[PDB]
Design a protein around this ligand. Structure first.
Ligand SMILES: CCCCCCCCCCCC
Ligand SMILES: CCCCCCCCCCCC
Ligand SMILES: CCCCCCCCCCCC
Ligand SMILES: CCCCCCCCCCCC
Ligand SMILES: CCCCCCCCCCCC
Ligand SMILES: CCCCCCCCCCCC
Ligand SMILES: CCCCCCCCCCCC
Ligand SMILES: CCCCCCCCCCCC
Ligand SMILES: CCCCCCCCCCCC
Ligand SMILES: CCCCCCCCCCCC
Lengths: 221, 55, 111
């Protein structure tokens, strides 16, 4: 394949040399190349593709939406993964399956790029579904959960922190939980989330309420 | 409107404040008051119902 | 990378200087650059992109759909978050996950 490609390259070089030469050296053959714009189209499409990719790479370098080793994604098209290398033509992304993903540079031209690798906090969200018969303790449970969250060493007190009775559900009364953690590490965030969930379970059990299963009323006949 | 297993009543209003926490607190208070009213008037909230013909 | 980019920039500068110069200074080489419109396309696409983004930013400044620190969204495409900065080319939006979101200015043109 390499030798065939070299042969074709030198054939193209000979063709271009013949085209450059005028009547003094053989015949220019300009009309043949411009017989129907074949040479024009051949040059134009290749140049357009190469220049588009090259300029997209240059703009990527100048704007700096992401760097090597950054976790990125896009709501427009999926490119999720960790950046491995930014070439002049193709950007290599390592997916979370440990598989290469080759993205042409021009695909970044007009899309919104998210950079989770540059996040400042990790969010924790969950819903507590209590039974409809536990409506008398909703306020106390919410207050207890908020107090527990406000005293947790792993929670960031400068970020949003909401715990309120949110909405009626089909078979439960839902309570929203919304907070952030100081750390941005995967394992530490997961451990903090697990600890918070266990504490929430303990609080709910201690206050006399319980979690609601999908309920249903049956009329027998 | 009539539902599959309940009679639905719509609630539609606005709050003076535009703050997230204050709006959520007002919503929770309104929901608790609605629950109290419904319980006091003798009605109750409907679970997904179903009629079963045994054989 | 910075030094390589500088080298390529000065190479392009030398190329443009050679193109500007006529027969008095070497050869203009205009035909080579216009052999198949390579230079024309290279200038046109870059200029179109840069000008589109710049003019979108200018229109954003003049119309004032939003300001710094404003929660925004769009039913057409998702950009939800709080505006962090409005640059000449890219607008930075902080999502509710506390992650940066870089939106080219031209994406606000028709939505
Ligand atoms: C082994 C034969 C190789 C022949 C390659 C021909 C290449 C033609 C290029 C035409 C470009 C317009
Ligand atoms: C110097 C600025 C370069 C801008 C490059 C834009 C490339 C757009 C390609 C779009 C292909 C669909
Ligand atoms: C070839 C075009 C070069 C454009 C360079 C733009 C540099 C932007 C720097 C922004 C720093 C905040
Ligand atoms: C037709 C224009 C081709 C331009 C190719 C430029 C390649 C630059 C590579 C820089 C080394 C990574
Ligand atoms: C038609 C022009 C082709 C230019 C090829 C550039 C190759 C650059 C390789 C950079 C490796 C780091
Ligand atoms: C280290 C080698 C760098 C070579 C850079 C070549 C840049 C070519 C620009 C062509 C623009 C049409
Ligand atoms: C002074 C008015 C500037 C208007 C800029 C419009 C840019 C449109 C870009 C569309 C790209 C798809
Ligand atoms: C370059 C074009 C400038 C257009 C300026 C429009 C100003 C609109 C002001 C509207 C105020 C209500
Ligand atoms: C080819 C036209 C380029 C125009 C670039 C204008 C850049 C203005 C920046 C203003 C400072 C924030
Ligand atoms: C090709 C023209 C490039 C113009 C680059 C403008 C850079 C403006 C930076 C403004 C920072 C506040």
């Amino acid at each position: 394949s390499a030798r065939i490609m070299s042969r074709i390259i030198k054939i193209t070089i000979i063709v271009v040399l013949v085209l450059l030469y005028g009547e003094h050296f053989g015949m220019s053959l300009s009309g043949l190349l411009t017989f129907g714009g074949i040479g024009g189209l051949a040059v134009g499409m290749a140049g357009k593709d190469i220049l588009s990719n090259f300029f997209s790479g240059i703009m990527l370098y100048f704007d700096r939406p992401f760097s090597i080793g950054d976790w990125i994604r896009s709501p427009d098209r999926n490119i999720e993964g960790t950046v491995a290398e930014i070439g002049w033509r193709i950007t290599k992304i390592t997916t979370f399956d440990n598989r290469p993903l080759y993205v042409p540079n021009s695909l970044f031209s007009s899309i919104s790029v998210e950079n989770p690798g540059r996040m400042t906090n990790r969010r924790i969200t969950t819903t507590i579904g209590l039974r409809y018969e536990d409506a008398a303790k909703v306020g106390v449970i919410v207050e207890a959960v908020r107090e527990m969250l406000k005293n947790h060493p792993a929670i960031d007190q400068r970020q949003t922190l909401l715990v309120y009775f949110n909405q009626f559900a089909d078979s439960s009364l839902n309570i929203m939980v919304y907070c952030f953690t100081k750390t941005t590490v995967w394992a530490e965030w997961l451990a903090a989330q697990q600890d918070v969930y266990l504490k929430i379970i303990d609080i709910v059990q201690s206050h006399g309420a319980d979690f609601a299963f999908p309920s249903q009323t049956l009329y027998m006949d």
